[PDB]
Symmetry: C3
Subunit: 35 residues, 3 copies
Amino acid sequence: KVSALKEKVSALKEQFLMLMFKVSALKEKVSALKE
Amino acid sequence: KVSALKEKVSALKEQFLMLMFKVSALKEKVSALKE
Amino acid sequence: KVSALKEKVSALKEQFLMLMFKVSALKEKVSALKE
């Protein structure tokens, strides 16, 4: 169970990094429209 | 402790799915403003 | 291992809260551009 959990947290950390990239890119695009 | 942790990860995975939906919907709205 | 995992989940929950704030602030900014 602890091993399954560690893999689940690993995959969720990878998901978070990809969503942080997606949100930073969106924030920059919105700043190009409006300061 | 392992059980408490599994529930905490479960709830955080549900949180992530809802934030992915929110960010995809926002990305589409921003693309409607600017390609 | 369980302790390391609990800290990893703690830090990821703090990361999520900060990304939820960032996305809510971006959503409001986009609504100021377009209803």
